[PDB]
Amino acid sequence: LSAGNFPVEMRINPSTGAISELTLKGDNRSMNWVVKTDGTQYPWVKDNYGWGLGYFTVVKGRETVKREWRIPVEISPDGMKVLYREGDIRILIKREIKQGDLVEEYSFTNEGEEPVSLYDVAVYTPFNDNYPDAQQCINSRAHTHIWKGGSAAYVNAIRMGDFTPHLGLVVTDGAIRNYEIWERGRKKANSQTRGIIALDLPDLLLKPGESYSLEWHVFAHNGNDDFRHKLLEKGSVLVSCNKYVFEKGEKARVECRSLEPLEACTAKMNGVPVPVKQEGNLCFVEVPMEQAGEVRFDFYYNGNKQTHADCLVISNTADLIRKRVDFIRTRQQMNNPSDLRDGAYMVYDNEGDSIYLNDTPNCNPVDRDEGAERLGMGVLLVKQYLLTKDPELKQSLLRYADFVRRKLQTDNYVTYSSVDQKNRNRGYNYMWVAELYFQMYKVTGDKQFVTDGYKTLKSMFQQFGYGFYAIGIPVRLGLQSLKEAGMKKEYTDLRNDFIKTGDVFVKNGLNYNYEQSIVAPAIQFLAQLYLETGSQKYLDEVKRQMPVLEAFNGFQPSYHLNEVAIRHWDGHWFGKRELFGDTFPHYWSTITGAVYYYYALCTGDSSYQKRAENVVRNNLCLFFEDGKASCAYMYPYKIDGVKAEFYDPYANDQDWALVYYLLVNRGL
């Protein structure tokens, strides 16, 4: 049983030959699926970024020249056939509407007398993934889930509100190996745009007169299941693994599904052939994961096609966490009686092998300071203390709790992230200080911590409002902390402050800058609230907003991406390299996994717990086997020409990923 037919329509730019506008006929919201490339949406995004235009670097001996195609030599009256010529290379674009889908074929032909090598070959696909405001986002923008799957590459653009129709792009000839991001910066809408995506073809060697062809289909679809079915119908494949992060010794099952059986399907594991089993239209590999590190599974099929999955093998998860807490204790806690920040857990430069003192220039000093998000290290050590009872952690926590109470907060519970207290008074910071205090009660017993938690939340309520959207508002912990102490006058007063927050979230709905870590913590809060009160109005709102949360997450066969929310700015604001661009994973992705944990308790639907476990498991790649950590993985091949695919060398705020990992897996 299903729904509507939405033929792809477009406007061709008569000067460039690019697709200016991409719409789905019969869409009641008439969304343009690409960023407008005439300056009218963003001043700095002009016609050179139009859909179907692109670039390559041509190398002949010592001669290296980058070329960008933009002005056709020939263009059809309808714009469906376009020919560009840049040096020796002809770029021919053929477009057709086949049964309501757009089929585009790009050919690259060496017209010259000498062989040529082409590097960094890419086509712009400027999907409308940006965040101008909540109303436009929900109705008229799309989360763009990109899979660099070679011959089986795709893009699944889910409208942010989850209203159908959605859009899909499936590669049916040639391959896409990666993508790049263009037009990011402090002067280019900052955190509010994902930028302009370009999809990278393989590097080519073209003899005189030889061609390389890329073909894709663009089409409307009705959601992830529909997208996957259509992807298969168009002759592509879907790769998936039982999971994407393994402990050493575990068995992996990697599956490659097609519509019809693949011919001569072969596979490799880090470049080494491994046996593939074929049953009908499933090929699968089953192997032990015997060595720590990256594992890439490649499938080779139908003569010249390939695709892959990215998995990670860690030594052991318990030990990874232990080693990380020891590193926080022995290397990221300031132990200098002379320094005003004495007890703090702090930002750490992994290249420099020292605590980062926030004294050199950078783009935003307050995001590299002594508190604010850095409280997650405290919550992590507390949770790890509860599971192991290492007295050296108790000693370190006692000192941290003193640093926070004595130096970050005033006597009146006004909360800062800096010992001087002459910087921003935020809102977000109060929830984590509060969570640290309630958590410290479980360590010792002192009911004073519990009062500090309450008086911190009350100070936030006084100053900011009742409907302040904020990450990790500690409802279930707050109340169990109060009740367990026996301060029953407080377990009602606070509960009623949370209930007044619940109702304002319910009144707002999806109206409220739009991003993952506004939407998700709202739902985290309303789900904990329902578990305490029982009020059906709150669980109703959770269910209504769940699809909107889920739309941030792809199902690509990579531990970097699988159920990992699209976030693309924290590298700039929190990292050493200060790179805007896709961070996969970034640790706040694990809030979504917290939502799924609670949602699984609210309903009895245990498949949300399995998903919860998947999300947090995938964030384990931010933690290394010597106890070091990274604040972000920069995912794309390049960002504005700057090479990415690296872990940012600062350990900053990422330890919340382990906080939510232990919540999901141990209830802590």
Regarding whether 423 and 378 lie in a shared domain, the answer is: yes
Task: Go through the chain and tell me how many residues it has.
Answer: 668
- Any domain includes 526: yes
The Cα–Cα gap between 350 and 347 comes to 10
Rounded to 5 degrees, φ, ψ at 83 are -125, 125
Residue 238, helix vs strand vs coil: strand
Closest CA to 200 of 239, 236, 237, 148: 148
> Given its phi and psi angles, is residue 635 left (phi above 0), alpha (psi -120 to 50 degrees) or beta?
alpha
- The C-alpha angle 413, 447, 391, rounded to 5 degrees, equals 100
The Cα–Cα gap between 480 and 491 comes to 9
Q: How many CB atoms lie within 10 A of CB 603?
A: 14
- Any domain includes 452: no
The Cα–Cα gap between 549 and 537 comes to 18
Residues 6+ apart with CB under 8 A from 357: none
- Any domain includes 205: yes
The Cα–Cα gap between 188 and 195 comes to 9
Dump the DSSP string for 78-146.
Answer: TSSEEEEEETTEEEEEEEEEETTEEEEEEEEEE-SSS-EEEEEEEEE--B--B-S-HHHHHHH-EEEEE
Note if the bond before 14 is cis, omega within 30 degrees.
no
- Any domain includes 375: yes
Residue 171, helix vs strand vs coil: strand
The Cα–Cα gap between 324 and 623 comes to 7
Regarding whether 191 and 58 lie in a shared domain, the answer is: yes
Give the domain-ending residue among 211, 235, 259: 235
Residues of the chain by 3-state class (helix, strand, coil), percent to 5: 35, 30, 40
- Any domain includes 13: yes
The Cα–Cα gap between 164 and 224 comes to 11
Q: Which domain holds residue 68?
A: 8-235
Tokens of 378: 């405290």
Regarding whether 615 and 532 lie in a shared domain, the answer is: no
Distances in Å between the alpha carbon of 668 and those of 231, 517, 587? 41, 21, 18
Q: Roughly what angle, to the nearest 10 degrees, separates helices 447-464 and 488-508?
A: 30
Regarding whether 181 and 69 lie in a shared domain, the answer is: yes
Q: How many domains does the chain have?
A: 5
Regarding whether 218 and 296 lie in a shared domain, the answer is: no
Regarding whether 370 and 229 lie in a shared domain, the answer is: no
- Taken in order 122, 550, 428, 617, is the CA torsion positive or negative? negative
- Which stretches within 328-446 are classed as H helix? 376-388, 391-403, 428-443
Regarding whether 577 and 481 lie in a shared domain, the answer is: no
Regarding whether 431 and 306 lie in a shared domain, the answer is: no
The Cα–Cα gap between 18 and 180 comes to 19
- Any domain includes 466: no
Asked whether the beta carbons of 652 and 373 are under 8 A apart, the reply is yes
Q: How many CB atoms lie within 10 A of CB 249?
A: 11
Give the domain-ending residue among 507, 532, 551: 551
Regarding whether 116 and 19 lie in a shared domain, the answer is: yes
What resolution in angstroms, rounded to 1 decimal?
Answer: 2.2
Helices (H) and strands (E) in the chain, counts: 15, 32
Asked whether the beta carbons of 40 and 48 are under 8 A apart, the reply is no
Tokens of 66: 């980058």
Strand order in the sheet with 251-257: 238-241, 251-257, 282-288, 277-279
Asked whether the beta carbons of 27 and 89 are under 8 A apart, the reply is no
- Which stretches within 244-388 are classed as H helix? 317-327, 376-388
Closest CA to 386 of 432, 430, 316, 438: 438
**Pairing of the two strands 74-75 and 63-69:** unpaired
Regarding whether 436 and 557 lie in a shared domain, the answer is: no
- The C-alpha angle 572, 177, 154, rounded to 5 degrees, equals 90
Tokens of 410: 């005033």
Residues 6+ apart with CB under 8 A from 411: none
Regarding whether 256 and 387 lie in a shared domain, the answer is: no
The Cα–Cα gap between 283 and 277 comes to 6
Tokens of 79: 């714009």
CA dihedral 130, 131, 134, 136 (to 10 degrees): -40
The Cα–Cα gap between 333 and 345 comes to 4
Give the domain-ending residue among 551, 579, 596: 551
Residue 133's CATH number: 2.70.98
Tokens of 67: 């070329």
The Cα–Cα gap between 425 and 402 comes to 20
User: Which residues share a beta bridge with 64?
Assistant: 59
- Any domain includes 322: no
Gyration radius from the chain CA atoms: 26
The Cα–Cα gap between 221 and 319 comes to 44
- Any domain includes 155: yes
Regarding whether 246 and 222 lie in a shared domain, the answer is: no
Experimental method: X-ray
Q: What is the separation, in whole angstroms, between the first and last Cα of the chain?
A: 42
Residue 265's CATH number: 2.60.40.1930
